[PDB]
From Swiss-Prot:
N-acetylmethionine modifications at: M1
Consequence recorded when altering L162R: Reduced phosphorylation by CAK and reduced kinase activity
Site (CDK7 binding): K9, K84, K85, L162
Modified residues (Phosphotyrosine): Y15, Y19
Lineage of the organism: Eukaryota, Metazoa, Chordata, Craniata, Vertebrata
Residues annotated as transmembrane: none
Its EC number(s): 2.7.11.22
Binding site for Mg(2+): N128, D141
Annotated organism of origin: Homo sapiens
Activity regulation summary: Phosphorylation at Thr-14 or Tyr-15 inactivates the enzyme, while phosphorylation at Thr-156 activates it.
Family designation: Belongs to the protein kinase superfamily. CMGC Ser/Thr protein kinase family. CDC2/CDKX subfamily.
Domain of life: Eukaryota
Residues reported to bind ATP: 10-18, 33, 77-79, 82, 125-128, 141
Name this polypeptide is given: Cyclin-dependent kinase 2
Amino acid sequence: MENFQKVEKIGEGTYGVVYKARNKLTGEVVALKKIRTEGVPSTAIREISLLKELNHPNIVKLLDVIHTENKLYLVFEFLHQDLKKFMDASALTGIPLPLIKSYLFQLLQGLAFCHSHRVLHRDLKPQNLLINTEGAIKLADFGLARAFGVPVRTYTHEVVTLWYRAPEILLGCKYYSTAVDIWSLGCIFAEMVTRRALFPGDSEIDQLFRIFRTLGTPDEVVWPGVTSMPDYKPSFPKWARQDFSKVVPPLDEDGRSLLSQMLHYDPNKRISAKAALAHPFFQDVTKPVPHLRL
């Protein structure tokens, strides 16, 4: 750490505490994440290391991976604000549609890039979407999920957010696909629009039932194979699907259409990041600048 000039805490991540730090030599200001060890898995080291090559305007750059004394530190490019803070800040008037559309468009490009490289996020949420004064938005922590493992109960017992988890994950499918990220982003899109989380579950079953209550309990017609999923129970209540117009008012039909394809139950039917970028909803996309108070 003596390589940095007085580092200061700025939050708690899934794996550990996140600090803002300045490199004593380069003068560069960066984000420093200490990963919470049994000597740290070599398997994880090589996988995380590969992410250093994933460069894209909409992906938070992984600068370095430092392994020392059973300790793993990840050095990332620093951005001053996250979408969760920005949404809370925009709570009164709501984020303007052009800015919501620009952010969604950029996030889909970031997802398309990662997915075309066989890298999945698996834990997307407003907190790991960082923005800057230029109107850019970037995905943070891509690939860390598969690199390490699924969350459970951190040293700080930090309550893991389930709000953006895809249904196939909740129903016990062990083989996650790129579709889980599209689901999460759909949930985030809905949240920017309505200013309220779409599915704020307080437990895994409550999360699943909130999804069922809004999109309808899935069956073999809409999701072939769903009744044979590991955690599926014939006892799940059967809720009828609600009208999308009631889901994200007052989003227009282009937006409602895209969200519906992002929220398809069948991971195989769910729209890919690539196809989503070509949806009519983005026909008039622009890049407005947000008003950030740093």
